[PDB]
Enzyme design. Structure first.
Site, short mmCIF file in Angstrom:
data_model
loop_
_atom_site.label_atom_id
_atom_site.label_comp_id
_atom_site.label_asym_id
_atom_site.label_seq_id
_atom_site.Cartn_x
_atom_site.Cartn_y
_atom_site.Cartn_z
N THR A 48 -0.44 5.21 5.45
CA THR A 48 0.33 3.87 6.17
C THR A 48 0.70 3.12 4.81
O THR A 48 -0.35 3.07 4.05
CB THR A 48 -0.54 3.17 7.05
N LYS A 53 0.68 -1.30 0.00
CA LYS A 53 -0.04 0.22 -0.02
C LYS A 53 0.85 1.20 0.03
O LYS A 53 1.58 1.58 0.72
CB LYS A 53 -1.12 0.04 1.10
N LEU A 67 -5.49 -0.47 6.25
CA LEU A 67 -4.31 0.27 6.63
C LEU A 67 -4.87 1.85 6.31
O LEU A 67 -5.57 2.24 5.29
CB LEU A 67 -3.06 0.14 5.72
N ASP A 68 -4.57 2.66 7.21
CA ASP A 68 -4.77 4.32 7.16
C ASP A 68 -4.24 4.71 5.95
O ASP A 68 -3.18 4.38 5.34
CB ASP A 68 -4.22 5.06 8.68
N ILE A 69 -5.10 5.89 5.53
CA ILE A 69 -4.36 6.52 4.25
C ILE A 69 -3.16 6.86 4.01
O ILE A 69 -2.66 6.53 2.80
CB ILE A 69 -5.48 7.89 3.88
#
Ligand SMILES: O=c1ccn([C@@H]2O[C@H](COP(=O)(O)O)[C@@H](O)[C@H]2O)c(=O)[nH]1
Length: 234
Positions: free
Chosen positions: A108, A70, A104-106
Protein backbone atom coordinates in the site's frame (compact mmCIF):
# COMPACT_ATOMS: atom_id res chain seq x y z
CA UNK A 1 20.24 21.36 14.32
CA UNK A 2 17.60 21.42 17.10
CA UNK A 3 18.48 23.54 20.14
CA UNK A 4 16.83 25.75 22.73
CA UNK A 5 17.38 28.45 25.34
CA UNK A 6 18.71 26.93 28.57
CA UNK A 7 15.94 28.61 30.51
CA UNK A 8 13.16 27.37 28.28
CA UNK A 9 14.59 23.91 28.97
CA UNK A 10 14.91 24.21 32.74
CA UNK A 11 11.34 25.55 32.47
CA UNK A 12 9.95 22.52 30.65
CA UNK A 13 11.91 20.08 32.84
CA UNK A 14 10.91 21.69 36.13
CA UNK A 15 7.28 22.50 35.45
CA UNK A 16 7.94 26.15 36.33
CA UNK A 17 7.66 29.33 34.27
CA UNK A 18 10.50 30.43 32.00
CA UNK A 19 10.55 33.53 34.18
CA UNK A 20 11.26 31.39 37.23
CA UNK A 21 13.53 29.00 35.31
CA UNK A 22 15.67 32.01 34.49
CA UNK A 23 15.85 32.80 38.20
CA UNK A 24 17.00 29.32 39.20
CA UNK A 25 19.72 29.70 36.59
CA UNK A 26 21.31 32.86 38.06
CA UNK A 27 20.96 31.13 41.41
CA UNK A 28 23.96 29.04 40.27
CA UNK A 29 21.82 25.93 40.42
CA UNK A 30 21.97 24.87 36.79
CA UNK A 31 24.91 23.04 35.30
CA UNK A 32 26.04 22.25 31.76
CA UNK A 33 28.89 19.85 31.02
CA UNK A 34 29.73 19.94 34.71
CA UNK A 35 29.88 23.74 34.89
CA UNK A 36 27.77 26.51 36.39
CA UNK A 37 25.76 28.41 33.76
CA UNK A 38 24.15 31.66 34.93
CA UNK A 39 22.79 32.76 31.57
CA UNK A 40 19.16 32.12 30.85
CA UNK A 41 19.62 32.56 27.10
CA UNK A 42 22.38 29.94 26.85
CA UNK A 43 22.11 27.99 23.55
CA UNK A 44 21.44 24.42 24.73
CA UNK A 45 22.69 21.94 22.12
CA UNK A 46 22.02 18.15 22.32
CA UNK A 47 25.66 17.20 23.11
CA UNK A 48 25.30 19.17 26.37
CA UNK A 49 24.66 17.66 29.77
CA UNK A 50 22.44 19.73 32.03
CA UNK A 51 21.91 19.31 35.75
CA UNK A 52 19.81 20.90 38.47
CA UNK A 53 21.30 21.10 41.97
CA UNK A 54 23.65 18.32 40.95
CA UNK A 55 20.81 16.15 39.65
CA UNK A 56 21.19 15.29 35.95
CA UNK A 57 18.17 16.56 33.98
CA UNK A 58 17.96 14.03 31.16
CA UNK A 59 17.87 15.83 27.85
CA UNK A 60 14.56 14.72 26.37
CA UNK A 61 15.03 15.28 22.63
CA UNK A 62 12.35 17.48 21.08
CA UNK A 63 9.58 15.69 19.08
CA UNK A 64 9.66 15.17 15.30
CA UNK A 65 6.96 14.65 12.67
CA UNK A 66 7.37 13.61 9.05
CA UNK A 67 5.23 13.09 5.98
CA UNK A 68 6.26 10.01 4.00
CA UNK A 69 4.99 8.66 0.70
CA UNK A 70 5.26 4.94 1.32
CA UNK A 71 6.43 2.94 -1.74
CA UNK A 72 5.47 -0.71 -2.31
CA UNK A 73 7.52 -3.58 -0.91
CA UNK A 74 8.28 -1.97 2.44
CA UNK A 75 6.61 -2.25 5.84
CA UNK A 76 5.85 0.22 8.66
CA UNK A 77 7.19 -1.86 11.55
CA UNK A 78 9.83 -4.49 12.41
CA UNK A 79 7.17 -7.01 13.47
CA UNK A 80 8.11 -8.75 10.19
CA UNK A 81 11.70 -9.80 9.33
CA UNK A 82 11.14 -10.69 5.65
CA UNK A 83 10.73 -7.12 4.46
CA UNK A 84 12.73 -3.92 5.06
CA UNK A 85 11.05 -1.19 7.06
CA UNK A 86 10.20 2.25 5.61
CA UNK A 87 13.05 3.49 7.80
CA UNK A 88 15.29 2.70 4.85
CA UNK A 89 13.99 6.04 3.55
CA UNK A 90 14.49 8.22 6.59
CA UNK A 91 17.96 9.71 6.64
CA UNK A 92 17.68 10.94 10.24
CA UNK A 93 19.51 10.56 13.56
CA UNK A 94 18.01 7.97 15.90
CA UNK A 95 15.41 7.32 13.20
CA UNK A 96 14.57 4.04 14.92
CA UNK A 97 12.72 6.08 17.53
CA UNK A 98 10.09 6.88 14.92
CA UNK A 99 6.89 4.88 14.50
CA UNK A 100 4.17 5.18 11.87
CA UNK A 101 1.06 6.83 13.28
CA UNK A 102 -1.07 4.39 11.33
CA UNK A 103 0.65 1.57 9.52
CA UNK A 104 0.30 0.84 5.82
CA UNK A 105 0.43 -2.72 4.46
CA UNK A 106 3.51 -3.81 2.49
CA UNK A 107 2.01 -3.08 -0.92
CA UNK A 108 0.00 0.00 0.00
CA UNK A 109 1.36 3.43 -0.82
CA UNK A 110 0.68 6.89 0.38
CA UNK A 111 0.58 9.15 3.35
CA UNK A 112 2.23 7.63 6.42
CA UNK A 113 2.82 9.99 9.32
CA UNK A 114 6.17 8.90 10.89
CA UNK A 115 6.41 10.26 14.44
CA UNK A 116 8.00 9.70 17.86
CA UNK A 117 5.24 11.62 19.66
CA UNK A 118 3.17 9.01 21.50
CA UNK A 119 0.41 11.35 22.64
CA UNK A 120 0.04 12.85 19.15
CA UNK A 121 0.08 9.47 17.44
CA UNK A 122 -2.53 7.82 19.66
CA UNK A 123 -5.02 10.62 19.10
CA UNK A 124 -4.81 9.86 15.39
CA UNK A 125 -4.80 6.08 15.73
CA UNK A 126 -7.20 5.26 18.57
CA UNK A 127 -9.94 2.75 17.49
CA UNK A 128 -12.28 4.89 19.56
CA UNK A 129 -11.32 8.04 17.69
CA UNK A 130 -13.00 9.35 14.63
CA UNK A 131 -10.27 10.08 12.11
CA UNK A 132 -10.79 10.31 8.38
CA UNK A 133 -8.53 8.48 5.97
CA UNK A 134 -9.13 8.97 2.25
CA UNK A 135 -7.76 6.47 -0.24
CA UNK A 136 -7.42 6.18 -4.00
CA UNK A 137 -8.56 2.59 -4.70
CA UNK A 138 -7.94 0.77 -7.99
CA UNK A 139 -10.40 -2.11 -8.61
CA UNK A 140 -10.26 -5.39 -10.52
CA UNK A 141 -13.82 -4.89 -11.73
CA UNK A 142 -15.75 -1.67 -12.37
CA UNK A 143 -17.25 -0.45 -9.10
CA UNK A 144 -20.73 -1.90 -8.87
CA UNK A 145 -23.27 0.91 -9.26
CA UNK A 146 -25.02 0.00 -5.97
CA UNK A 147 -21.72 -0.22 -4.05
CA UNK A 148 -21.91 3.50 -3.27
CA UNK A 149 -24.89 3.22 -0.93
CA UNK A 150 -23.74 -0.12 0.50
CA UNK A 151 -20.75 1.71 1.93
CA UNK A 152 -22.79 4.65 3.27
CA UNK A 153 -25.13 2.41 5.24
CA UNK A 154 -22.28 0.03 5.96
CA UNK A 155 -21.03 -3.46 5.19
CA UNK A 156 -20.27 -6.52 7.25
CA UNK A 157 -16.69 -7.68 7.10
CA UNK A 158 -16.44 -11.43 6.64
CA UNK A 159 -16.75 -12.87 10.14
CA UNK A 160 -17.04 -9.53 11.96
CA UNK A 161 -19.83 -8.56 14.38
CA UNK A 162 -20.34 -4.87 13.69
CA UNK A 163 -20.77 -3.00 10.43
CA UNK A 164 -18.27 -0.69 8.76
CA UNK A 165 -19.09 2.86 9.84
CA UNK A 166 -20.55 4.91 6.93
CA UNK A 167 -18.04 5.56 4.16
CA UNK A 168 -18.38 7.91 1.18
CA UNK A 169 -17.30 6.58 -2.20
CA UNK A 170 -16.64 8.80 -5.20
CA UNK A 171 -16.07 7.48 -8.74
CA UNK A 172 -13.01 8.85 -10.55
CA UNK A 173 -13.03 6.15 -13.21
CA UNK A 174 -15.04 2.93 -13.59
CA UNK A 175 -12.20 1.01 -11.91
CA UNK A 176 -10.60 3.80 -9.84
CA UNK A 177 -12.40 5.32 -6.83
CA UNK A 178 -11.64 7.64 -3.91
CA UNK A 179 -12.83 6.26 -0.57
CA UNK A 180 -13.20 8.02 2.78
CA UNK A 181 -13.54 6.03 6.01
CA UNK A 182 -13.54 7.29 9.61
CA UNK A 183 -12.68 3.87 11.01
CA UNK A 184 -9.47 1.91 10.94
CA UNK A 185 -9.85 -1.87 11.10
CA UNK A 186 -7.22 -4.27 9.77
CA UNK A 187 -7.08 -4.21 5.98
CA UNK A 188 -10.46 -2.48 6.07
CA UNK A 189 -10.69 -1.22 2.49
CA UNK A 190 -9.58 -4.50 0.92
CA UNK A 191 -12.13 -6.42 2.94
CA UNK A 192 -14.83 -3.81 2.28
CA UNK A 193 -14.67 -4.30 -1.49
CA UNK A 194 -14.50 -8.00 -0.65
CA UNK A 195 -17.96 -8.01 0.94
CA UNK A 196 -19.50 -6.31 -2.11
CA UNK A 197 -17.84 -8.70 -4.55
CA UNK A 198 -14.86 -6.83 -6.02
CA UNK A 199 -11.10 -6.92 -5.62
CA UNK A 200 -8.57 -4.27 -4.71
CA UNK A 201 -5.72 -4.17 -7.22
CA UNK A 202 -3.90 -1.09 -5.89
CA UNK A 203 -4.50 1.14 -2.87
CA UNK A 204 -3.15 4.69 -2.25
CA UNK A 205 -3.69 6.75 0.90
CA UNK A 206 -4.06 10.45 0.19
CA UNK A 207 -5.30 11.89 3.45
CA UNK A 208 -5.27 11.44 7.23
CA UNK A 209 -7.46 13.91 9.07
CA UNK A 210 -6.26 17.39 8.21
CA UNK A 211 -2.95 16.39 6.60
CA UNK A 212 -2.90 15.58 2.88
CA UNK A 213 -0.08 14.07 0.83
CA UNK A 214 1.77 16.69 -1.21
CA UNK A 215 1.22 16.38 -4.96
CA UNK A 216 4.98 16.47 -5.58
CA UNK A 217 6.34 14.10 -2.88
CA UNK A 218 7.65 11.18 -4.92
CA UNK A 219 7.21 7.71 -3.37
CA UNK A 220 10.06 6.93 -1.00
CA UNK A 221 10.47 10.67 -0.22
CA UNK A 222 9.57 12.38 3.04
CA UNK A 223 9.70 15.78 4.78
CA UNK A 224 9.26 17.20 8.33
CA UNK A 225 5.73 18.33 9.16
CA UNK A 226 4.75 22.01 9.07
CA UNK A 227 3.91 23.80 12.34
CA UNK A 228 0.32 24.10 11.10
CA UNK A 229 0.35 20.44 10.04
CA UNK A 230 1.22 19.29 13.58
CA UNK A 231 -1.39 21.47 15.24
CA UNK A 232 -4.05 20.62 12.64
CA UNK A 233 -3.67 16.82 12.33
CA UNK A 234 -7.10 16.10 13.87
O1 LIG B 1 -9.48 0.89 4.96
C1 LIG B 1 -8.32 0.44 4.93
C2 LIG B 1 -7.23 0.97 5.70
C3 LIG B 1 -6.04 0.39 5.56
N1 LIG B 1 -5.71 -0.79 4.69
C4 LIG B 1 -4.51 -1.39 4.57
O2 LIG B 1 -4.48 -2.13 5.83
C5 LIG B 1 -3.31 -1.74 6.65
C6 LIG B 1 -3.13 -2.01 8.20
O3 LIG B 1 -2.53 -3.15 8.68
P1 LIG B 1 -0.94 -3.21 9.11
O4 LIG B 1 -0.16 -2.18 8.05
O5 LIG B 1 -0.83 -2.78 10.68
O6 LIG B 1 -0.38 -4.74 9.04
C7 LIG B 1 -2.93 -0.34 6.10
O7 LIG B 1 -1.72 -0.50 6.24
C8 LIG B 1 -3.28 -0.44 4.55
O8 LIG B 1 -2.34 -0.98 3.67
C9 LIG B 1 -6.80 -1.38 3.86
O9 LIG B 1 -6.70 -2.39 3.04
N2 LIG B 1 -8.03 -0.70 4.05
Amino acid sequence: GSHMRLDKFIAQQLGVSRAIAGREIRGNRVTVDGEIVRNAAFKLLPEHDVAYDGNPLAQQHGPRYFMLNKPQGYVCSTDDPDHPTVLYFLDEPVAWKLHAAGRLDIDTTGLVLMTDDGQWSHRITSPRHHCEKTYLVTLESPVADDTAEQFAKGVQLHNEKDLTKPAVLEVITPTQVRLTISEGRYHQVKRMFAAVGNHVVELHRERIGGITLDADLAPGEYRPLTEEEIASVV
